Design a protein around this ligand. Structure first.
Ligand code: ANP
Ligand code: ANP
Ligand code: MG
Ligand code: MG
Lengths: 587, 394, 456, 224
């Protein structure tokens, strides 16, 4: 093997000569300590290496060894419910092996448990012709998720032999006869994280995800296979939004990438998700979750690794026919690592110092999200929904990370610090935000609900837009000028804001609202406005209507706390509104 | 010490010179055929970046540069009170007599103090006494009120071998100290580099109000002896009058007034008026407790920075004697703008609004030199500097 | 000469020095510069290539000369000599004693960069710390192991607030008192003397470790000072089992020293000339806080910074807020109104308050009344603003109530005094009294079971 | 001659190296690794380098494995009388599932400036059918007369109504509407399409439809 020689160390960048046999994307063991790095540039025999560990104490003259393999993930039984660092080292095993509470360096650790026994259930008959993505069997990895064993890419042939049994992910479970001879398969495949896993066909993402967050599902919905960004100032609620979606969305698997954020937030997830268990089902959220953690004070270049490790694991489960959500908190930290390396490389800087390829790196990531037909004869469908936080300096969404992200995503949940500072959460600005899936989702909702949902949503937003106009009229000419109809519009708008948009993630019932409950809550809010407008036309006064409806408006304001099993109490409010108003107008 | 540099660049107050590898950062140098006075501020290979404290018109590449081997310093000793100095402590009246001109020439080298003036030194310490920095060996009655105390310099420690009262110049040895290194002769004068704070034993809380006699200040916004006050305001608002009022009437022992990048007539006003303002109790004029540092707006821009450090060092020297000093800096924006000008000529990366990134710490370090202190010396005497600073925001 | 000395200085620019013809030098290695007068200056290797090294000098490069000054590379990073005898002692910014006390023989030397806590080894901070200050305990709850800074401004009483927190803070269990580690970063004598005097008056000095970088000390030393302090803190917490409260001021001076180096290196700037890695660099300090499973001790951080021109969007408060677990914001408007402490709760935040409060930790009404007080105060301030532009007559009858609520909230709830220590029970009771000003039908954040039990 | 020398990609912009004989505003074609074709325009050309904007954007383009072809002419529109009755997208490609246009000629879409001496002054009435316009703000043949509106206002309905009703009293069967939609919503596009189709206005119209969901640099080409 060729041994390189360090010629330069500058933070996360190491340069080494005598590397002519290595190639770009090769992983390396760098210096006497053998810290883990990746070659990102090759010029003659000189490699530029991006080190994924601390480089303090390393200098010129030390050896460098290329492993000849690209940065990759192990994909197989044992991956679900793990917490990995940015290059897929399991953090629990890291602690056990080093016998330390702190992160050392140079530690090489296989990602998965290579000695655990799993029961492989063979589902394909011998003699069957197979190719990439074909399912030969499965492992019941968790109570929630069946881990399908797929023929890897690059393999095609005839199943010579296969049988069910107890195996480790290292045991050959299947012999395929290919044109190039007999080939053995295990339950584990490796995949280089910078290459998107191939698919048969990209599809339009058009099934709305049920996040359970009312403002999102109703007014700014994301589809299964869609891409949304949540940019906002510090404290506005990006991480809570992503945790809510990770907890409650109706996907099969969740991949959460903690990219350059707080250590306690990852601690929180890994401790809370095993305790969030549906009582009837007995299944915890951790049994459908993969966590990637590279905290803000962990090695900065490992922020990039964590993003590609996460999206590749998402693609692997997408390929099995699952719907996956990948949360990246926060993509600004990834962009900062690209900016740091670009400067160490002495490249020409772009706007605010980010490299010129910043936009295309972000585009390449979101190109990997999406709804797909996966490889294989069954032509099954899967999807990756990409939800990304952006953390713009000072909340200025005109900065480059946000603007390049918004050029490629379809959904913008713009968080607003003035809403956060009146404790209006989620702090989504309902005027500036948008979802380019709104029209198709409204038509889908109309069909699946067999109700005119799209017109309720349009009416809700129309009322909110009028409130903005009316508010401007109030400052200019005073509150007194407004007609009774205008005051009613302000009351219904306030009802949408406080009774529907506002949703406390820390309340046991408010934290999640089913599609069915959302329909009923929005109907009674709009029903009050319509019945009240009817009363006004019959000659009642706005103040008379308000005074006569305290009890029923109070039921509206608390319908968010009604249990999912008791939805009839929300829809019964409709009858109460109509009878109370009928009494008021009858005088 | 024979190295001779060669100018390779002249850009206003910035001069670059090659063949300077034997000189030290912050050493003074004589620049060009004219030998204008400058300071080395950066070194790259054999090339020095020099900040010049005089006009550089008519200087070009190929001319010599000679380091003096000494950092920018003040002379501290009898002869300093009632003087008006330029920013690098050249006495302006002597400048006028030596050059025979009403206008400011360049390349003129002048000692700060009169080295031929005869002074009476009154020895007050006895031979055989162990001494260290700050101990007082005697004094000179520089004015009827202000005793100029002769202190052991920083860095000197040992036993007084010989001391004598008599009539001397500031260059004659007045005392011999026996130190571990050997015998050391002391004069009435010590030099100090103006960029280094003079050491103290410790700082104390400045808690005695200064009487300015200005009602709004003494009543609602008072400053203490050893405190610091900023006076920001638009042009014409009255910053200079406030500082003159405090210079005239405050109940301190000495006033150092630094005219930093302002009007020449305002300094003339002070030398005209302070000798005419006589205290009724003592019969001494205000000029007999005042030191003036003048570097006007049209004088060399980098010497605005020199004028600040020259003034604060002189104030620290009298503080060390146990006196309360007020220092007025009119105006610190002109000093900051000097830093911005040089920063741009050096092609530095800018800090806030074009100022160098080290603006904040330069300002902080200056104000930390103000304060109430226990001075060095076995008597542990107390002194103070109260800093009053004009600021002139656009 | 035990260590080889190099006379190969080839560049001296501000705090930066280049040294040629070196070998065996490592990134972040500690260096010493020996000068002819015998002064010793310390520095740090910023990068190494072939036989050249770029170094930053902590004490500055004044007087340095290629012939006179020698450089020696010590073969290890900057470390702090730690020992239990540091308690009750005062050090300078590089960890050297400055109190004229007895010499200290360190138990061991620790790299001041420290190491990252394994996220899965962390214990999530959830122990209510009663600071006795209602605007914090109730609305922006501090828990043990949190990092919760004070965002302030020039001339504002952030030192009084910080000293009051250190004076009054306690968990409600039987734990030992906090050991205090104080880091002074570029601050004035008077600012530092305020803390010294308070620590001596209470006796807290006897359980305190202090690292003093003052405005007269070299600015580049500010970069090591908080790492020195956090290394002592983590040693006392995780090796000795102490509960450590770290107070660090002023972090604006820290970031400005970082920018001085960054600018001299000609790095490409982020916003306002600050280095692109400002966020990451600050995070290597503020993430050194928390609790570890199986270990008894803890590290709680109260950094203090002044917002330049009172602007929270400045990179220094902005990136700090993106890192820390909330912030306590002081405002000049509340301070001129005589509110002590002048905490504006509206932009303030604590991110760890949910699991640290409620039944069994404080009381069952904590979260709901917090949310209701905050909402009512927001509406009340809005009413007050409208009364300023349009007069008192413009307000509606309900908005007149909210404006009066906001006034009493500032004058009686927030404004408690810097020497007032309220129990959490008194704080919660005071909250219900203010909530009683409002119509019960306006209390939408509170469920009826709580209203019926606590509302008067 | 296809170049494999794409250097960098910045938003919709792309840099191409080692080029020769390239002209300002020349049309270019990018052959992507997936085999799709994206057209573009030379914005800047210097030495052996060319800077181009890609109408459909650069997302999904692997520049190392994609090639660029310079076509030797500016971007043009294949014009024909058969465009009447047809709906195109923002780049002039059929959107109505109808046959490809067989052009009579190709025209540089920048057009040329009319010589002021050759201009005729606007004359003669255009009846929009809208009183407030026809009476008080009369539209004249050859004039430019814009509508200034706001979000939420019904300029959509006004545009459709004018397209539907505009006529010249002077002449018969020589009146045509060209409608360009720029960044409009899907529902807005739906509305314009059904209105033109249901009234028969489509049979005297040419439509170029760029939608909000479409790549935004298409909008530069659409009005031209
Ligand atoms: N949906 C919500 N329901 C209730 N409280 C919320 C909600 N969203 C945010 N909050 C509150 O706001 C705090 C800050 O939320 P968080 O998600 O941490 O903001 P952030 O945008 O991620 N800030 P940062 O990590 O610095 O970029 C939380 O700790 C809660 O106190
Ligand atoms: N206390 C005062 N009593 C009387 N007149 C005053 C007083 N302060 C200021 N003035 C008048 O205001 C003029 C300007 O004051 P001055 O102190 O020169 O302003 P300034 O702030 O220093 N402007 P500048 O030097 O350009 O920054 C004086 O010449 C007086 O005419
Ligand atoms: Mg967050
Ligand atoms: Mg003035």
């Amino acid at each position: 093997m060729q041994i390189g020689k360090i010629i330069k160390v500058s933070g996360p960048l190491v340069m080494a000569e005598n590397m002519s046999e290595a190639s770009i994307q090769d992983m390396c063991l760098v210096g006497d300590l053998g810290v883990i790095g990746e070659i990102i540039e090759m010029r003659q025999d000189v490699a530029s290496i991006q080190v994924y560990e601390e480089t303090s104490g390393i200098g010129p003259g030390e050896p460098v060894r290329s492993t000849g393999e690209a940065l990759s993930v192990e994909l197989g039984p044992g991956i679900i419910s793990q917490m990995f660092d940015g290059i897929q080292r399991p953090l629990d095993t890291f602690m056990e092996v080093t016998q330390s509470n702190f992160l050392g360096r140079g530690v090489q650790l296989p990602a998965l448990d290579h000695e655990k026994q799993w029961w492989f259930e063979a589902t394909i008959e011998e003699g069957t012709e197979v190719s990439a993505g074909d399912i030969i069997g499965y492992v019941d990895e968790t109570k929630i998720i069946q881990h399908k064993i797929m023929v890897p890419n690059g393999i095609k042939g005839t199943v010579q032999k296969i049988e069910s049994g107890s195996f480790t992910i290292d045991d050959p479970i299947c012999v395929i006869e290919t044109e190039q001879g007999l080939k053995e398969l295990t339950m584990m495949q490796k995949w280089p994280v910078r290459r998107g896993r191939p698919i048969k066909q990209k599809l339009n993402p058009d099934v709305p995800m049920i996040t359970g967050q009312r403002v999102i599902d109703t007014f700014f919905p994301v589809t299964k296979g869609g891409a949304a960004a949540v940019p906002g100032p510090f404290g506005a609620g990006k991480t809570v939004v992503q945790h809510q979606i990770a907890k409650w969305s109706d996907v099969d698997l969740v991949v959460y990438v903690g990219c350059g954020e707080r250590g306690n937030e990852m601690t929180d997830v890994v401790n809370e998700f095993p305790e969030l268990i549906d009582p009837n089902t007995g299944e915890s959220l951790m049994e459908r979750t993969v966590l990637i953690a590279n905290t803000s004070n962990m090695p900065v270049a490992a922020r990039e690794a964590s993003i590609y490790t996460g999206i590749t694991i998402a693609e692997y489960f997408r390929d099995m026919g699952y719907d996956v959500a990948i949360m990246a908190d926060s993509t600004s930290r990834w962009a900062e690592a690209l900016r740091e390396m670009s400067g160490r490389l002495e490249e020409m800087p772009g706007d605010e110092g980010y490299p010129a390829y910043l936009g295309s790196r972000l585009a390449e990531y979101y190109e990997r999200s999406g709804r797909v037909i996966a490889l294989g004869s069954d032509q099954r469908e899967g999807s990756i929904t990409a939800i990304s936080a952006v953390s713009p300096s000072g909340g200025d969404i005109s900065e480059p990370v946000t603007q390049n992200t918004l050029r490629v995503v379809k959904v913008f949940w713009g968080l607003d610090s003035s809403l956060a500072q009146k404790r209006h959460f989620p702090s989504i600005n309902w005027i500036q935000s948008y979802s380019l899936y709104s029209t198709e989702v409204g038509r889908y909702m109309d069909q699946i609900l067999q109700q005119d949902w799209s017109d309720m949503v349009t009416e809700g937003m129309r009322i909110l837009q009028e409130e903005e106009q009316l508010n401007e009229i109030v400052r200019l000419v005073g509150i007194d000028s407004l007609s009774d109809n205008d005051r009613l519009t302000l009351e219904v708008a306030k009802s949408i804001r406080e009774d529907y948009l506002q949703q406390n993630a820390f309340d046991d019932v408010d934290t999640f609202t089913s599609r069915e409950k959302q329909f009923n809550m929005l109907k009674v809010i709009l029903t009050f406005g319509k019945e009240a407008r009817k009363a006004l036309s019959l000659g009642a006064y706005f103040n008379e209507i308000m005074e006569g409806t305290v009890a029923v408006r109070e039921r509206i304001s608390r319908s968010k706390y009604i249990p999912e099993e008791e939805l009839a109490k929300i829809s019964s409010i409709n009858e109460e509104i109509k009878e109370t108003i009928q009494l008021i107008v009858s005088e | 010490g024979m190295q001779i540099g060669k100018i390779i660049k002249v850009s206003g107050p910035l001069v670059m010179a090659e063949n300077m590898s034997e000189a030290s950062i912050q050493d003074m140098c004589l620049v060009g055929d004219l030998g204008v006075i400058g300071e080395i501020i950066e070194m790259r290979q054999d090339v020095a970046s020099i900040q010049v404290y005089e006009e550089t018109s008519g200087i070009g590449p190929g001319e010599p540069v000679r380091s003096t081997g000494e950092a920018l310093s003040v002379e501290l000793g009898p002869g300093i009170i009632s003087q008006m100095f330029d920013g690098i402590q050249r006495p302006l009246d002597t400048f006028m007599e030596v050059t025979q001109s009403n206008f400011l020439g360049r390349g003129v080298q002048l000692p700060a103090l009169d080295h031929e003036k005869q002074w009476w030194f009154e020895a007050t310490i006895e031979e055989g006494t162990e001494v260290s920095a700050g101990d007082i060996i005697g004094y000179v009655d520089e004015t009827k009120i202000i005793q100029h105390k002769i202190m052991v310099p920083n860095g000197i420690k040992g036993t007084v071998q010989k001391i004598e009262s008599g009539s001397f110049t500031i260059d004659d040895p007045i005392c011999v100290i026996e130190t571990e290194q050997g015998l050391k002769e002391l004069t009435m004068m010590q030099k100090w580099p103006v960029r280094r704070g003079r050491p103290i034993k410790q700082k104390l809380n400045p808690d005695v109000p200064m009487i300015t006699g200005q009602r709004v200040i003494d009543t609602f916004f008072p400053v203490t002896k050893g405190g610091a006050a900023a006076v920001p305001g638009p042009f014409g608002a009255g910053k200079t009058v406030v500082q003159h009022q405090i210079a005239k009437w405050s109940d301190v022992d000495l006033v150092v007034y630094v005219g930093c990048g302002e009007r020449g007539n305002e300094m003339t006003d002070v030398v005209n008026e302070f000798p005419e303002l006589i205290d009724p109790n003592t019969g001494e004029s205000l000029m007999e407790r005042t030191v003036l540092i003048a570097n006007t707006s049209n004088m060399p821009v980098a010497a605005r920075e020199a004028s600040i450090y020259t003034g604060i060092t002189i104030a620290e020297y009298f503080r060390d004697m146990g006196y309360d000093v007020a220092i007025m800096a009119d105006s610190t924006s002109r000093w900051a703008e000097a830093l911005r000008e040089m920063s741009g000529r050096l092609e530095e990366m800018p800090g806030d609004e074009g100022y160098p990134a080290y603006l904040g710490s330069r300002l902080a370090e200056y104000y930390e030199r103000s304060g109430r202190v226990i001075a060095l010396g076995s008597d542990q005497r107390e002194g103070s500097i109260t800093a009053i600073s004009a600021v002139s925001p656009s | 000469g035990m260590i080889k000395e190099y006379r190969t200085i080839k560049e001296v620019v501000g705090p930066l020095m280049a040294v040629e013809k070196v070998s065996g030098v490592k990134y972040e290695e500690l260096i010493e510069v020996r000068m002819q007068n015998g002064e010793i200056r310390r520095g740090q290797v910023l990068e190494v290539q072939e036989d050249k090294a770029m170094v930053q000098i902590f004490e500055g490069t004044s007087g340095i000369n290629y012939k006179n000054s020698s450089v020696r590379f010590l073969g290890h990073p900057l470390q702090l000599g730690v020992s239990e005898d540091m308690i009750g002692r005062v050090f300078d910014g590089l960890g050297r004693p400055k109190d004229n006390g007895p010499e200290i023989l360190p138990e061991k030397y620790l790299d001041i960069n420290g190491e990252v806590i394994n996220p899965i080894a962390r214990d999530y901070p959830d122990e209510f710390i009663q600071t006795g200050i209602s605007a914090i305990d109730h609305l922006n709850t501090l828990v043990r192991g949190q990092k919760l800074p004070v965002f302030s401004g020039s001339g504002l009483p952030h030192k009084e607030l910080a000293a009051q927190i250190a004076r009054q803070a306690t968990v409600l269990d039987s734990s030992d008192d906090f050991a205090v580690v104080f880091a002074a970063i570029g601050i004035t004598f008077e600012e530092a003397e305020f803390f010294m005097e308070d620590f001596r008056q209470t006796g807290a000095i006897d359980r305190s470790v202090m690292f003093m970088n003052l405005a007269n000390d070299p600015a580049i030393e500010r970069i090591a000072t908080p790492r020195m302090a956090l290394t002592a803190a983590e040693y006392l917490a995780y090796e000795k089992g102490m509960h450590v409260l770290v107070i660090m001021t002023d972090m604006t001076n820290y970031a400005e020293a970082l920018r001085e180096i960054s600018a001299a290196r000609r790095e490409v700037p982020g916003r306002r000339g600050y280095p692109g890695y400002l966020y990451t660099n600050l995070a290597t300090l503020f993430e050194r806080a928390g609790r570890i499973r199986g270990l008894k001790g803890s590290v709680t951080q109260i950094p203090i910074l002044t917002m330049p021109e009172d602007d929270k969007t400045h990179p220094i408060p902005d990136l700090t807020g993106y890192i820390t677990e909330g912030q306590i914001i002081l405002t000049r408007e509340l301070y001129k109104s005589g509110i002590q402490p002048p905490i504006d709760v509206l932009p303030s935040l604590s991110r760890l308050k949910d699991k640290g409060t409620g039944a069994g930790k404080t009381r069952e009404d904590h979260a709901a009344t917090m949310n209701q007080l905050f909402a009512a105060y927001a509406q009340g301030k809005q009413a007050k603003e409208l009364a300023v532009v349009l007069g008192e007559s413009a307000l509606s009858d309900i908005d007149k109530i909210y404006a009066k609520f906001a006034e009493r909230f500032e004058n009686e709830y927030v404004n408690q005094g810097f020497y007032t220590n309220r129990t959490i029970t008194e704080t919660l009771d005071l909250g219900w009294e203010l909530l009683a000003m409002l119509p019960r039908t306006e209390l939408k954040r509170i469920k009826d079971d709580l209203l019926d039990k606590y509302l008067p």
